[PDB]
Write a protein that binds this ligand. Structure first.
Ligand code: ATP
Ligand code: ATP
Ligand code: MG
Ligand code: MG
Lengths: 510, 47, 114
RNA sequence: GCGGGAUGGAGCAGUUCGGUAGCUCGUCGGGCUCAUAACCCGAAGGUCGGUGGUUCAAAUCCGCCUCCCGCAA
RNA sequence: CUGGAAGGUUAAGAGGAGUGGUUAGCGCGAAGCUACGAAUCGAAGCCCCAGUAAACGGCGGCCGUAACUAUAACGGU
RNA sequence: UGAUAUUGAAAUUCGUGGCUUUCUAACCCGCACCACUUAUCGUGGUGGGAGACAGUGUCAGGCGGGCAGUUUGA
């Protein structure tokens, strides 16, 4: 028993999020904490760090407040120095700022500071945030190495299938502990959803049959009440006896309703859409021996790049290759070389950024979407709902929203920006398990061109049309069949199999 | 629209009981009122 | 470990199957056209019976069997290519047999298709 | 008089707690055929019965009205 | 009603990290005695799955269509 | 339907505790033979069968119009 959370209401700030929240965390146990976006998985982690007992680690998931602190003294925020030989992370260097790193190079300078902290319980956020397919196959081997207790937030159902020992599912009812991996949690959450709809389908069919018996007694009654003499005590008495028939099956109906009440409420299969402008030309953007450099780092030497009308491009590489800086050259970065990034003079662009430099902090939700040119208030508030902004989140500063929200807020600005191309940079990274499908259909039901930068394999596996790549300092293509030829010696090998005919088999008994 | 308790900030705790709308005042309310243990006007935070 | 098994080729008009045993019918390893993920009308053909007959042997090659004496069963388009897949992958056939079931007039057979 | 209705031409979801007008069939114009049906391609057609109210926002909620339906006048 | 390898949820009992009381000592708190008390373990049943009507029980609407009219063998939903 | 008492023995097994086996001395037989004995009761002896189960006490959970006591406005 490493830690008990005695039943108390959870709340980050003035607002209250949950009441009656309790759970325990053993020793030497890695415990996943999954839940919907905006429910409080990160506020609960702040609580145990600040207001709770035993010292902890608290690897955050934004690092935005501290963006000018020199790295190598952010790592030493707690305190000859065992860091050079701790480059298993492959962290670049410790002389930059910390708001100047890659998006996924600072999710392993905060994982470095968390492992070297020497505390009993490690409070970790997302940690597969922004990471590659190789740096994400490395810490799967790292979490299975330390005898400390971890309590992390993942919502990544490939990482969640090997690491955890139990799962803690926040609901706004409290935490419901499960055992096993994500697939053991998922099986039991399915059996639990059948019973509520079989139980709901069985109360509707029990209460409609009592309404129809009741309604039949009343057709008999008003037909009999006009035929009965008011001066007959026998015919009246049969009339009051018939009323008892329906008056007592109205009391059976009223004890089913005021006693048997549930709903199947999470049933709305709506979906989003965006409409392009039908470019009508061949090339969208182009590079002409472009080069770039970050004061010592030579990112791109002279390279070529092209995107034509109605294409889908998938850029690849690793952490630090230059994906999010190539997307910057397309809008504006003013190359140091000549380069001359050749762009069409009539382009609309829909930008989804890794860091939320699109969104204006210190700006309410309602008054940020309304910053566009000729947006009205009805069509703005009405599209703001259907993205799950429940008409009361209108007066919230963007600076104090969730991470899942405000990744959903720059999708509600894409709808009002009818583009020619969508430039999406890690679009399914901060989204929970249920919202990663509602925006994979959106990207596929867009009839324009898109440039996708993404690290999850099961999203960029069925949409692979064109795949560039950054190997040394230059982009490559998928029309480079220099890697693996098919080695056409089949000419020598599909000549033995040519002679087993369909009639040669008919003969030649064995 | 809730019920709120105004507790003294130095003389220690509850003196007054009021109401508030938590959509218009989501924070904790602040008002100077008479603490009768200090015999003096002080500041009262909502509990 | 083991030496001298027998290969049990089993080809039908959909799907061949090769299973290698010891000489006591002990099932060293099996494999077959549809396991490699061949869909119908490819599942059936002589190429796939020579994949399948060598994803087997090479995965019981590895028990040091090297001499097999095959027994064959079925009609099959892809029977015989599965015995140049075998003897290809280093196994040294001994001598073969066509053990197919033949009633000495037993039970009655299904209708025939129109 | 009481019950249930009205959502492109037909038949129907969606209303039950307001937030991007939907499904099958048919209609129209091309193709295929010696010709027709079937099949393939492309489009049209929506006051959510009428008329007012509530709301940042109404097919959804609130009154009034004319139709259709079933019992019973 | 019958039959289900497992998985979930559940009793008594087992277990005893912790929180209170008192006070030899020096507002802190050793033993002892005391008021309690969590994690884990723990069966039927129930959830869930298949079968059974000479078991209990149940056995539909609207629309268009034929060389008189009317009906509709035929069609849509 | 569980825990626990009556209630024991040896081993294998995986974690001093449990699981499962096997053994028999306890307990059980409306079971054969022999005495009491004129006896289809009972008690005692002897073989067999089963056996730490079952039956029995205490505590616990499910089911429970089979059966009770009642309520079912002005
Ligand atoms: N300073 C603040 N004042 C008031 N409310 C706040 C403040 N900061 C955050 N919140 C609120 O607290 C909630 C916390 O959501 P939280 O960020 O914990 O969700 P999450 O589990 O991180 O989801 P995701 O990881 O998908 O973003 C948000 O709804 C947000 O509105
Ligand atoms: N302002 C800057 N000054 C100096 N160097 C920078 C600056 N911004 C980025 N870099 C360097 O450029 C490299 C690539 O940054 P970039 O934003 O392309 O990362 P990325 O490829 O988007 O990473 P990820 O794919 O994980 O998001 C990094 O190694 C970083 O050190
Ligand atoms: Mg968060
Ligand atoms: Mg980046």
């Amino acid at each position: 028993m490493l830690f008990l959370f005695e039943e108390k209401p959870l709340e980050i700030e003035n607002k209250q999020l949950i009441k009656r929240l309790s759970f325990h965390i053993e020793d030497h146990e890695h415990l996943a904490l999954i839940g919907v976006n905006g429910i409080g998985k990160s506020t609960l982690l702040h609580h145990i760090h600040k207001n709770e007992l035993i010292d902890t680690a608290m690897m955050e998931q934004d690092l935005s407040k501290h963006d000018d602190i020199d790295v190598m003294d952010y790592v030493m925020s707690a305190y000859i120095i065992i860091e050079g030989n701790k480059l298993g992370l492959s962290s670049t260097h410790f002389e930059q700022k910390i708001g100047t790193l890659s998006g996924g190079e600072q999710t392993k300078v905060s994982f470095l500071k968390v492992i070297l902290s020497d505390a009993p319980l490690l409070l970790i956020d997302q940690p597969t945030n922004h990471m590659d397919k190789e740096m994400k196959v490395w810490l799967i081997k790292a979490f299975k190495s330390e005898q400390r207790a971890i309590l992390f937030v993942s919502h990544d159902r490939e990482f969640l299938n090997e690491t955890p020992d139990a799962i803690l599912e926040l609901t706004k009812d409290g935490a419901t502990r499960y055992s096993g991996h994500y697939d053991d949690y998922k099986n039991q959450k399915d059996i639990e959803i059948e019973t509520e709809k079989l139980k709901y389908e069985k109360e509707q069919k029990e209460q409609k049959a009592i309404e129809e018996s009741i309604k039949k007694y009343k057709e008999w009654y008003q037909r009999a009440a006009q035929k009965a003499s008011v001066r007959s005590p026998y015919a009246q008495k049969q009339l009051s006896k018939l009323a008892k028939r329906f008056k007592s099956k109205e009391h059976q109906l009223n004890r089913k309703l005021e006693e048997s009440k549930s709903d199947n409420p999470l049933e709305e299969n709506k979906s989003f859409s965006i409409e392009n402008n039908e470019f009508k030309s061949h090339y969208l953007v182009r590079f002409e021996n472009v080069s770039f450099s970050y004061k010592s780092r030579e990112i791109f030497k002279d390279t070529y790049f092209e995107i034509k009308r109605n294409q889908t491009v998938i850029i690849e590489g690793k952490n630090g290759s230059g994906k999010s800086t190539l997307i910057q050259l397309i809008l504006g970065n003013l190359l140091p070389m000549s380069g001359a990034v050749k762009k069409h003079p009539d382009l609309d662009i829909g930008y989804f950024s890794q860091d939320f430099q699109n969104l204006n902090p210190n700006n309410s939700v309602l008054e940020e979407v309304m910053d566009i040119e000729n947006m009205m208030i009805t069509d703005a508030r009405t599209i703001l709902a259907s993205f799950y902004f429940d008409k009361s989140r209108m007066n919230d500063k963007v600076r104090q929203l969730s991470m899942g929200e405000k990744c959903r807020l720059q999708f509600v600005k894409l709808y009002f920006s009818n583009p020619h191309i969508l430039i999406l940079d890690q679009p399914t990274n901060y989204f929970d398990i249920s919202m990663q499908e509602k925006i994979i259909q959106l990207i596929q039901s867009f009839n324009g061109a898109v440039i996708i930068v993404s690290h999850d394999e099961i999203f960029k596996d069925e949409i692979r049309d064109q795949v560039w790549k950054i190997e040394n300092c230059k982009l490559i293509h998928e029309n480079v069949s220099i890697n693996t030829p098919i080695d056409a010696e089949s000419m020598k090998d599909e000549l033995k199999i040519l002679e087993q005919y369909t009639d040669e088999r008919n003969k030649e008994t064995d | 629209r809730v019920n709120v308790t105004l507790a003294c900030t130095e003389c220690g705790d509850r003196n007054y009981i009021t109401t508030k709308n938590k959509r218009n005042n989501p924070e904790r309310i602040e008002m100077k009122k008479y603490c009768p243990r200090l015999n003096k006007y002080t500041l009262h935070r909502e509990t | 470990n083991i030496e001298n098994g027998v290969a049990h080729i089993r080809s039908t008009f959909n799907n061949t199957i090769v299973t290698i045993t010891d000489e006591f019918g002990n099932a060293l390893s099996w494999s077959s056209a549809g396991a490699l993920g061949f869909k119908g009308s490819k599942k059936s053909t002589p190429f796939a019976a020579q994949m399948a007959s060598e994803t087997a042997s090479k995965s019981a090659m590895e028990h040091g069997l090297k001499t097999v004496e095959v027994t064959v069963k079925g009609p099959g388009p892809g029977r015989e290519s599965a015995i140049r897949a075998l003897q290809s992958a280093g196994l040294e056939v001994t001598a073969i047999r066509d053990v197919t079931p033949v009633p000495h007039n037993g039970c009655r057979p299904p209708k025939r298709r129109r």
